[PDB]
Structure 1
Amino acid sequence: KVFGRCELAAAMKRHGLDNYRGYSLGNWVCAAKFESNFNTQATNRNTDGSTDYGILQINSRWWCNDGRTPGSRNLCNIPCSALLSSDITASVNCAKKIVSDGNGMNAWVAWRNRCKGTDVQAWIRGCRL
């Protein structure tokens, strides 16, 4: 599924991501924009052989099982495919774990490089939330 911007904002809020660990909703929408362009089915292979899955490009090195990332963990206790669903529940639950791991949203390199410090409220501006 390719979400609309306000549609994704609403779904993220529904699932308790808004202000989670102090990160406003626009931070999360911005991260999703640059990780996946709001496409739940996005996948990307990393140099290390891990793969990133879903709207927040959650990595199989630590967070999910895909059966083909040697030496990896599955700390969200989910198949990586669950992260591609039109329903964002599994991505949101796993993101909450990731952002609580110590480095906040810096876990998402694209957030650090493209969202951090910017006017992230623009990503939710206009939305009925």
Structure 2
Amino acid sequence: KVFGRCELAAAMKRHGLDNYRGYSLGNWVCAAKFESNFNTQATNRNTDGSTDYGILQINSRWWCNDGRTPGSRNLCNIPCSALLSSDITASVNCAKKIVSDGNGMNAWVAWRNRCKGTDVQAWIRGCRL
């Protein structure tokens, strides 16, 4: 599913991301735009053989199981495929674990490069939240 901006903003809020570890909602919407273009089905393969999955481009070297990333962990206890669903629950739950791991939202390269330090409130402007 390809979310609208406010539709995603509204779902993230319901699943408890707004201000999660002190990250306001616009951070999370901005990270999703630049990671996945708001598409739950996005995948991207990395040089090290791992793959990034879903609207929040969660990596299979540490967080989910894809069966093809040798020696990797599965810290979220889930199949990677389950982060491609139209229901963003699994993505959100796993992202809460990632943002808690010590590096905050710097875990997401496109957040660091494209969202950090910008006016992230724009990403929720206009929305009925």
Check whether TM > 0.5. Answer: yes
Q: Extract unaligned runs of 5+ from structure 2.
A: none
Partner of 2:44: helix, strand, or coil?
strand
Question: How many residues in Structure 1 have an aligned counterpart in Structure 2?
Answer: 129
Partner of 1:95: helix, strand, or coil?
helix
Tell me by how many angstroms 1:60 deviates: 0.2
Q: Extract unaligned runs of 5+ from structure 1.
A: none
Deviations 1:35-76 (A, max 9, x none): 000000000000100000000000000000000001100000
Please give the alpha-carbon distance, in whole angstroms, between the structure 2 residues aligned to 1:111 and 1:71.
27
Tell me by how many angstroms 1:31 deviates: 0.1
Task: Name segments (4+ residues, structure 1) moved above 6 Å.
Answer: none
> Superposition RMSD on alpha carbons, in Å?
0.3
**How many percent of aligned residue pairs carry the same amino acid?**
100
Deviations 1:49-105 (A, max 9, x none): 000000000000000000000110000000000100000000000000000000000
Tell me by how many angstroms 1:17 deviates: 0.6
Tell me by how many angstroms 1:109 deviates: 0.8
Please give the alpha-carbon distance, in whole angstroms, between the structure 2 residues aligned to 1:75 and 1:58.
11
